[PDB]
Paper text:
RAD51C is an enigmatic predisposition gene for breast, ovarian, and prostate cancer. RAD51C binds XRCC3 (CX3) to form a heterodimer, and separately with RAD51B to combine with the RAD51D-XRCC2 dimer into a hetero-tetramer (BCDX2), whereby all paralogs except RAD51B are considered essential for cellular survival. Yet, recently RAD51C replication functions distinct from HDR functions were described, including replication fork protection, fork restart and fork reversal.
Limited proteolysis analysis of hCX3 suggested that a small RAD51C N-terminal domain (NTD) is flexibly attached to the CX3 complex. Consistently, crystals of apCX3 with both full-length proteins diffracted to a low resolution and determined preliminary structures lacked electron density for the RAD51C NTD. In addition, we solved high-resolution crystal structures of apRAD51C NTD to 1.6 Å and nucleotide-bound apRAD51C CTD to 2.3 Å. In analysis with BILBOMD22, a structural model of full-length hCX3 based on our apCX3 and apRAD51 NTD crystal structures matches hCX3 in solution with excellent fit (Chi2 = 1.32). Notably, based on sequence conservation and shown by our structures, the NTD is generally expected to be similar between RAD51 and the paralogs. Also, putative Holliday junction resolvase activity within the N-terminal region of RAD51C was proposed, albeit other recombination intermediate resolvases have been identified since.
Residue numbers in the entry: -1 to 60
């Protein structure tokens, strides 16, 4: 519902905030565009850590 909210306005872990910024992600929609395996490939993390970001932004923007 709030796909255009900035990722920096959420209390994501410091480590994943750094990874999102360094790989060029800006908004909720930039993350929620992707499945866990797609997001983990881009951020160079494992699938479960990608799932975690996705599920948290899904509940927070709804
Ligand atoms: Zn895209």
């Amino acid at each position: 519902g709030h796909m255009n909210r900035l990722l920096t306005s959420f209390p994501l872990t410091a480590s994943v905030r750094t990874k999102l910024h360094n790989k060029g992600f800006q908004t909720v929609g930039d993350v929620l565009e992707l499945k866990p395996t797609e997001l983990s490939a881009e951020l160079e993390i494992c699938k479960e850590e990608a799932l975690e970001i996705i599920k948290f932004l899904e509940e927070e923007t709804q």
